[model samples]
Target: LGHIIVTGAGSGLGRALTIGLVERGHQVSMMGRRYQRLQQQELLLGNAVIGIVADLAHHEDVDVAFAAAVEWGGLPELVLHCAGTGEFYTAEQIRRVMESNLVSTILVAQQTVRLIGERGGVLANVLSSAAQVGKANESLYCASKWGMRGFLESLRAELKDSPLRLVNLYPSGIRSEFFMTPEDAAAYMLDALEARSSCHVTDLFIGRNE
Candidate 1:
């Protein structure tokens, strides 16, 4: 239907979402830090997916990627912020996790909000269950996700009157290697975007039924 930008699209949930979006007939710009990885996705999906190598935490890289997206398929109607990383360690790991998750989310969200302007669009942040509770050994990961949760909540309130739709998806411990399979989640997201005008499904907590 419209153009979409998916961050961290080289693998995991991001890759799945990109595939889902393309299969559903939407132009997608796949972004990641590794050029080769991004190229693989692009080659897999052909022209439907444009691979853009960019560091999510850097503003300049983001700017370049956004420009490339616009050139490839007009302005993006939706932005799925899936770029993130985590590790259990000391100060350096904490900083890396925070920068990758929290800072990148803010930067991307800000840029998308600006690009969409008054026309409005969808901004979905692919968060984790860590956002809701504290976990041992995952202090930094939890902290980053929690920070992003707070930011997105405030952003939703801030854009309450606007047509911009904000969504936060939390899935508990994806056991299948990749984060929740992209098919169902991607379909859900697409449906949410379509129903953005009438319904407001702000936060979604998805988990495996065992």
Candidate 2:
């Protein structure tokens, strides 16, 4: 296993993925805005994981964080972007969601590709089912996700002849404080990663039945 970077690693799906990666003997660089929460995870995982405090919405913060991750985990072979936020609200919320989900994803992808260079690495974006569907009060959330989906699709096309593997994951409702359980989401992501070489899954959708 190679070094991996997981954003939004302080909790939820990001934390779950980080733990699974560490358990599989991969050095993980965790990035999140909550430094204290990230520190706690570091305490639990020890040196196998390094926590980098970063606000993905900002370029400078992301730059510093990526540099730190490389310093600690070496050049990452994979960059899993799981940092996103959504809510049912008004104008201000719309801006926040767009900045957090859409803009951040694009910026991170740019940085990841630049750092990984021709060595070829995985750039996985954790998207939502909302990107494919629309809901009443989730207008803003869906808009941001759809924007990200378009961005990733364009990016995949741009890197078609390159070694970088672009993946977009869409998981159905989970059982969590936000959505479903992190464990299940983590399992699905790991399974997808394991099948990457043979499957070459560019867009994956996973869900549970009632």
Candidate 3:
């Protein structure tokens, strides 16, 4: 158990993961754009958790969030990149979709890799199962996920000799009203990281009910 940071902690999957990390005795730094929600989560978790407001869509926000988290938790041993966005769009929504998913992942990963360095750390990217098999309305979402999976997979290989562990969690149809819950995804991520080695689990399909 160590200090961990999770983005998109305001709701959905990020919220779930934050709670899970705290419950497991890991000091969690929750980051999201919503301060009230983060504060509420902290109040629930007590001292085991700290919330920082950040918008992952911006690089500067990510930098500030990382600095604040490091200041609060010393050095994070793991970063759960659970913040994600999915939009069903026509071709017109392409740019927005790309910015929300692919761009955000890249920015967050860049910072996390820098922080983890040679000593190693864990990175769990929450990718959707839709990436594995595409859906008609979710074309842009699938493309973003596929892009993310490819980027992280390559990064994992590039850092093979290092102590770093990169894992991707693919959830099928998550039970939550909002696609997937961070808590459930975080639990699977914890298990994946524990078993992770040089081999990377590129995709995980989670059923909504199961």
Candidate 4:
């Protein structure tokens, strides 16, 4: 019912999800790394959404971004970790990929747990379908997703006594030979998250015009 944080809020499904939230009259903190895109989004959406740019892969950046968001909209009911980029064929640096994907989650979760401590909130992470399957050229990306699932599940058990809920989203990308639209994916996420559903294969928004 309160504000929602949409990280990677500049583009793709993140952008679509923000639009969906605002359409429902929810205030959103749009966090991203791109100035122009975030500005464009701020212009497009009104006061209900605020843009806070940060390289979430870094520790300091996430701190400022989250703090700025709360100052603007109070403690968020949900922190949607939708930030990451991927390529089908370039499996270059393991450290860089893991840092960008996994470590960022570590930092974000730490802050999320700390900020919403006792009051308790939902932390929804946007994992990929790659976390569920193996692909030939996307091994590094897959590894990052797998580790996120591993880390967050462990985090869940650690926080079992707390009221905070963690919803891990596994979505097929727009790069999946270009089929799923952002709206469909956003709808799937929004509904399931609000329902507080534990993720499963059937919940995968690998949808299309179907």
Q: Which is the leading candidate under lDDT?
A: 2
Q: Runs in model 1 with CA error above 4 Å?
A: 129-136, 175-197
- Tell me the tens digit of each residue's lDDT in model 1 across 149-181: 889899889998987888887765543322345
Task: Give all TM-scores, in the order shown.
Answer: 0.87, 0.91, 0.84, 0.86
List, residue by residue over 67-122, the lDDT tens digit for candidate 4: 89999999988898874556443346546656687778888888899988578878
Candidate 2: list runs displaced more than 4 Å.
129-136, 176-179, 195-199
Worst 10 residues of 3 by lDDT: 128-137
Measured by TM-score, the strongest candidate is 2
2 or 4: which has the higher lDDT?
2
Error of 2 at 21 (Å): 0.5
**lDDT by candidate, in order shown:** 0.77, 0.81, 0.75, 0.78
Clashes of each: 0, 5, 7, 0
lDDT of 3: 0.75
As a whole number from 0 to 100, the lDDT of residue 62 in candidate 2 is 89
Give the worst 10-residue stretch by lDDT in candidate 1: 173-182
Please estimate how well model 2 matches the true structure, expressed as its whole-model Cα lDDT.
Answer: 0.81
Q: Which ranges in model 3 have alpha carbons more than 4 Å from their true place?
A: 88-94, 129-136, 175-184, 195-203
